[PDB]
């Protein structure tokens, strides 16, 4: 198969959620990376963009995406569809969207837009965007809503998605908060791709299965605070009414959308038979009180593919796998410490020589950090390795063989110069140079609404490489606790 990693990826998926198949996640073909002309590799929408610079003085990645998001969003003829984690939009990334809006508007065009942010504030938001659009307003069908989907499983949505006409989709790691990745001498390091084809389809189909909810709960306070432009109704299935159900073919890149519905929207998919071996117990729920859906729920997977998707990439690895997330552990309480499967599935590939890069954000960012140092992440490999290689002593020379573990800096310095660490917040996962996922869900317990894409093109891949990867191994690899090419193993 040209598509090794996807199929073992998509056959995974049909297994948890055959039911969802279509709208939360889905296998496209046609798809195009969607960078310019004079730089192909711009499809990476990497913010700040300025390696080797403690002041960030050239934001080349920043500046690219949020032209990229005008850009995207003027090219409207019929729905802009956008999802992020409140606060709403503000600074640049609301004059991009304010700027793209208009710009659709003066073409003649007619708009319907929906934004949803997981959390007075979605009315003020509206009538913030009706009066800075002002006459284009006109030609626009508003609908802004904020929603909670579990209080007590913390869920709400955690997508950060931009779709266009069903055409066009910027998704990743991104929120749009000025004072941590714009204004300031310290911006969040992270990371979008942009993309065309059938696969923004289906991010279109996504939004409208969360959509579709929010508007049936949207007369429940707490749940559901929702606003809309004039006289105009909730569209729960704006892009199943406004575009065409198979996207436009624009390129031959395949791509598995991906995403999870949470805790409150729906507790299963009634078509699954999947029926998982669920790890032995390990120490990641730190308190006997807690309801692990991370670990110990099955209905939970099939409605939240995602978890299972991202394991059965880092599973299809034949040579390299590259983690570059804020965590791979959470804070508990609330959540477990770690999923117990996907350090499993690292521990396996480590066991077999397939070598294994985390990256993870500075621990005096404890905030962009939830661990006090990487010994919380070499201990559990460590742990999990001991499992599957015969005790504690194979198990650290697998890891110490096979593992480069650091925190992140994007330049000689140990922190920015204005004293600040790095902070990092990428979801991004890579294989073999082949097949990456990049999307808002963390590798750390999180039991929110998700969504990412997985790509199979060895092109892009090294494309990746080439701009983030490489840049970040460059500078981050001086703070590794474990190291396999330099013989490091602390
Ligand atoms: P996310 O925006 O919490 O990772």
Redesign the pocket.
């Known amino acids: 198969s040209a598509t090794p990693h996807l199929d073992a990826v998509e056959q995974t998926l049909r297994q948890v959620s055959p039911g969802l198949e279509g709208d939360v996640w889905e296998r496209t073909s046609g798809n195009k990376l969607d960078g310019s002309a004079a730089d192909p590799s711009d499809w990476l929408l990497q913010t700040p963009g300025c390696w080797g610079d403690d002041k960030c003085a050239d934001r080349v990645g920043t500046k690219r995406l949020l032209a990229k998001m005008t850009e995207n969003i003027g090219n409207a003829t019929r729905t802009v569809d956008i999802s992020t984690?409140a606060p709403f939009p503000n600074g640049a990334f609301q004059d991009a969207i304010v700027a793209g809006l208009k710009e659709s508007a003066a073409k003649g065009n007619k708009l319907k837009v929906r934004i949803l942010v997981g959390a007075v504030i979605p009315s003020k938001y509206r009538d913030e965007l009706t009066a800075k659009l002002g006459k284009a307003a006109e030609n626009i069908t508003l609908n802004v809503a904020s929603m909670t989907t579990s209080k007590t499983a913390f869920s709400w949505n955690?997508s950060?998605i931009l779709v266009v006409d069903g055409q066009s989709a910027l998704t990743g790691?991104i929120?749009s908060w000025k004072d941590d990745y714009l204004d300031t001498t310290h911006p969040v390091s992270d990371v979008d791709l942009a993309l065309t084809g059938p696969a923004a389809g289906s991010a279109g189909r996504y939004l409208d299965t969360l959509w579709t909810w929010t508007c049936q709960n949207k007369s429940n306070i707490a749940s559901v605070w929702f606003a809309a432009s004039g006289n105009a109704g909730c569209m729960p299935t704006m892009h199943k009414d406004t575009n065409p159900k198979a996207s436009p073919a624009t390129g031959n890149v395949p791509v598995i959308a991906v995403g999870g519905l949470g805790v409150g929207i729906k507790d299963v998919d009634p078509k699954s038979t999947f029926r998982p071996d669920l790890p032995t117990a390990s120490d990641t729920k730190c308190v006997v009180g807690l309801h692990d859906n991370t670990n110990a729920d099955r209905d939970y997977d099939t409605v939240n593919p995602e978890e299972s998707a991202l394991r059965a990439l880092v599973a299809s690895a034949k040579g390299h796998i590259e983690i570059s997330q804020?965590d791979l552990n959470a804070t508990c309480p609330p959540l477990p410490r770690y999923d117990i499967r996907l350090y499993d599935a690292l521990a396996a590939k480590m066991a077999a020589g397939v070598k294994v890069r985390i990256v993870v954000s500075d621990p005096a960012n404890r905030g962009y950090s939830q661990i006090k140092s990487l010994s919380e992440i070499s201990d559990t490999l460590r742990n999990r390795l001991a499992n599957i290689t015969g005790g504690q002593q194979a198990a650290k020379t697998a890891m110490c063989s096979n593992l480069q573990l650091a925190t992140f800096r994007s330049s000689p310095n140990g922190k920015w110069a204005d004293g600040h660490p790095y902070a990092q917040?990428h979801?991004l996962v890579s294989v073999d140079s082949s097949t990456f996922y990049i999307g808002?869900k963390?590798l750390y317990p999180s039991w929110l609404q998700d969504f990412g894409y997985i790509v199979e093109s060895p092109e892009a891949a090294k494309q990746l490489d080439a701009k983030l990867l490489d840049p970040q191994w460059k500078y981050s690899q001086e703070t590794a606790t474990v190291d396999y090419a330099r013989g490091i193993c602390n």
Do not use: D, E, I
Request: charged share 20%.
């Open positions: 984690l955690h950060k790691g929120n804020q917040h979801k808002s963390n």
